[PDB]
Symmetry: C3
């Protein structure tokens, strides 16, 4: 099965993706931004050295590279988990990480939204910052509801599932959010 996994940045989605790769066999865990970076270096070796360079390209070339990455993802395997972002916040507002072509190509069975509590997100982002912009509770609640609207739109267009995993409850022990999300996702795949 194929699921696009998303959440607000730095909340622990990458932790879940890396931890999913160990526990599931014949499951592909892949980060969309990374494939975009690789194909951008391949097609524009001259310009692209750091992964921030994808910002600078012309939007037509960047969209072409997004399509190429969607193709590379499209044939990988049977079980896929695509780690990307419904939307990223910029000075000009929110911008979608996916283009319609990406979904048409990957043909995902579903979209998964990891919804955390804003306090946990702030504390986790500061924890990771200390280990190596500071948004407010309201900024993050917004970001999450907007991710929700984006996924529902993508579902209405491509007829795929919308699965909202709740991780807003208080942690009884550190890393319980990650474990619960991993277990729900696994439970979901092997149904």
């Amino acid at each position: 099965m194929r699921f696009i996994l998303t959440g607000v940045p730095g909340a622990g989605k990458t932790t879940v993706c890396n931890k999913l790769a160990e526990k599931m066999s014949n499951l592909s865990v892949v980060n969309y931004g990374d494939v975009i970076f690789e194909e951008a270096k391949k097609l524009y070796p001259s310009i692209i050295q750091v992964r921030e360079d994808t910002r600078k390209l012309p939007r037509a070339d960047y969209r072409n590279i997004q399509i190429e990455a969607a193709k590379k993802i499209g044939l990988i395997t049977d079980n896929l988990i695509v780690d990307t972002h419904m939307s990223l916040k910029t000075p000009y507002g929110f911008y979608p990480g996916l283009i319609p072509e990406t979904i048409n190509i990957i043909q995902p069975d579903g979209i998964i939204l990891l919804e955390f509590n804003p306090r946990d997100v702030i504390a986790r982002r500061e924890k990771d910052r200390l280990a190596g912009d500071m948004e407010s509770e309201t900024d993050i609640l917004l970001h999450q509801q907007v991710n929700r609207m984006f996924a529902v739109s993508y579902s209405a267009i491509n007829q795929c599932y919308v699965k909202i995993i709740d991780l807003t409850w208080p942690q009884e022990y550190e890393f319980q959010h990650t474990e619960y999300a991993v277990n729900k996702i696994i439970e979901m795949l092997n149904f």
Copy 2:
């Protein structure tokens, strides 16, 4: 005029449909799930005996059946009211009840959402059971999701979105149903 009527399950949408079919003339009402069941028995008698059997079909066959059902619905009359669901909850998440083909075929003038209070929905669902047990948060989510789905379908197909508020407390039983029927009629005979 043509309106797709939706709400969360077991909330009283079917009652409103029955009462509209009674009070309204020159308007024919239909249940999408029932037509899907009929065409599934028609095209696949081997498998389809109960209306839950549609689950077992390959998704390609089920989509073909939805297409055929939409064709008959679109032809059925001039004024329509189609009882369907914006989205249904499954172990894999929410899934839209409509596919784009259904809307392109029926070309509804609008979509109508009956939005209830979760407490009313819980009490009504248990009342009907006596004649899964979701929580207030589950139901608020489901309805907000119905909202997003309807607005998306509107942006794509350039159609109306009418949200009927029934979250206020009932002064007498069956006032929600009455108010909804009256608003829908008022809207139709404009």
Copy 3:
């Protein structure tokens, strides 16, 4: 750059536009409705005299005029700010202000939503009425729907969505308008 500016009616969206047109160089601010009205009197003088007369035209004629106006707007300038409405309320429900052709023609970089507090909007509308009546909940709904419409357009046409918050209390009159103008300018000169 091209931004479609939206908000609920009579909340001060037009004031933000007028003050921006005053403050920004090489910036043209234009109202979609006004171009629609002008081309409607030009092309259909018989029916169109007051700007409400746009109501009476056939929806085909109204759409053709919308296309002609969107053509004119995209043609009209370099730096643009288009004053419109994500959605308008009608007896049949909410209906979107933009058509797909409008966006394809204008190719806006983004959408901007001025989101107010319902009390501020109501009080501002009564202020404007007295100078020459929805409920708080009606307006919260209208705005959540505006939001959903903008997000849908965003997914379909890959444009920005900027939500400017004006629901805090005004410490002095015209602070909402001033803050919005400043945020938008800061955004433009990035």
